[PDB]
């Protein structure tokens, strides 16, 4: 990860808490003398040896993806104090808490948009070897121009959150890119939902065995056909007939190409 040097950073605001420190924004001043804004975590005083190690092992996880659709390492402090992460900055937040802000707001060529960005980092992700076993709208990151960016690679792992797992890495751990596709089909329900939880507050026992017995989430409201059916695809018990990411971008981009077949509508509780 490149090594940043401090005098090129400065921190305007403190936007909440993380897990090893405080969470802000501020300005990344570029080789070039170009400015732009970034998020900026800070290491807390007095972290451990082991705060430190995966504080920026999560960083380095972070910086082996180049992609639009995932979140960008600027770099990072490790040679002055506090010890820095810089990313990209995104204005709008999480993806989940963002569209419960907005709850039918958008129009569904602008959801799918979403949904083509976070297909296309997954895909990049999945090419590179990588499962993400977190993926889930909260992991989402949306910009100003509603750009949404994986981030979160905290459990990310070189080849648990029940509501986002499938059900064979619930069983036996069994994750693969294709565990992360179930992931993706349950983001796809968490935006059309416009950020509801998945399965609510089902006991968690109830959401496993629900699922395990071919339960599957209802169709959220005025949810396209085309798209409800690409969440039940997602949802197969058989990982090997679930879509590859790089299928579900090519099925997002023909319902872009032409808006028209996303006005065909599908017509809680889970259905069977
Ligand atoms: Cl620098
Ligand atoms: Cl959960």
């Given at each position: 990860?490149?090594?940043?040097?401090?005098?090129?950073?400065?921190?305007?605001?403190?936007?909440?808490?993380?897990?090893?420190?405080?969470?802000?924004?501020?300005?990344?001043?570029?080789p070039?003398?170009?400015?732009?804004?970034?998020?900026?975590?800070?290491?807390?005083?007095?972290?451990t040896?082991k705060?430190?190690?995966?504080?920026?092992?999560?960083?380095?996880?972070?910086?082996?993806?180049?992609?639009?659709?995932?979140?960008?390492?600027?770099?990072?402090?490790?040679?002055?104090?506090?010890?820095?992460?810089?990313?990209?900055?995104?204005?709008?937040?999480?993806?989940?808490?963002?569209?419960?802000?907005?709850?039918?707001?958008?129009?569904?060529?602008?959801?799918?948009?979403?949904?083509?960005?976070?297909?296309?980092?997954?895909?990049?992700?999945?090419?590179?070897?990588?499962?993400?076993?977190?993926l889930?709208?909260?992991?989402?990151?949306?910009?100003?121009?509603?750009?949404?960016?994986?981030?979160?690679?905290?459990?990310?792992?070189?080849?648990?959150?029940?509501?986002?797992?499938?059900?064979?890495?619930?069983?036996?751990?069994?994750?693969?890119?294709?565990?992360?596709?179930?992931?993706?089909?349950?983001?796809?329900?968490?935006?059309?939902?416009?950020?509801?939880?998945?399965?609510?507050?089902?006991?968690?026992?109830?959401?496993?065995?629900?699922?395990?017995?071919?339960?599957?989430?209802?169709?959220?409201?005025?949810?396209?056909?085309?798209?409800?059916?690409?969440?039940?695809?997602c949802?197969?018990?058989?990982?090997?007939?679930?879509?590859?990411?790089?299928?579900?971008?090519?099925?997002?981009?023909?319902?872009?190409?032409?808006?028209?077949?996303?006005?065909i509508?599908?017509?809680?509780?889970?259905?069977?």
């Open positions: 990860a490149k090594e940043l040097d401090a005098t090129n950073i400065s921190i305007d605001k403190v936007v909440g808490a993380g897990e090893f420190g405080e969470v802000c924004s501020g300005r990344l001043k570029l070039s003398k170009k400015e732009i804004s970034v998020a900026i975590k800070t290491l807390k005083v007095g972290y040896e705060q430190r190690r995966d504080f920026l092992g999560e960083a380095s996880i972070m910086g082996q993806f180049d992609h639009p659709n995932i979140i960008r390492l600027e770099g990072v402090v490790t040679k002055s104090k506090p010890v820095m992460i810089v990313t990209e900055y995104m204005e709008n937040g999480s993806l989940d808490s963002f569209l419960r802000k907005h709850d039918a707001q958008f129009t569904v060529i602008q959801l799918v948009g979403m949904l083509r960005g976070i297909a296309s980092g997954m895909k990049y992700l999945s090419d590179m070897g990588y499962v993400h076993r977190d889930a709208a909260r992991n989402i990151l949306i910009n100003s121009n509603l750009v949404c960016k994986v981030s979160d690679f905290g459990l990310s792992r070189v080849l648990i959150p029940i509501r986002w797992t499938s059900p064979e890495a619930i069983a036996y751990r069994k994750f693969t890119s294709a565990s992360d596709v179930w992931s993706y089909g349950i983001v796809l329900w968490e935006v059309m939902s416009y950020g509801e939880r998945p399965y609510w507050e089902m006991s968690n026992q109830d959401v496993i065995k629900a699922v395990d017995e071919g339960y599957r989430l209802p169709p959220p409201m005025d949810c396209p056909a085309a798209l409800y059916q690409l969440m039940l695809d949802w197969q018990k058989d990982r090997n007939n679930r879509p590859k990411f790089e299928q579900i971008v090519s099925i997002l981009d023909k319902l872009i190409r032409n808006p028209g077949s996303l006005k509508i599908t017509s809680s509780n889970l259905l069977l």
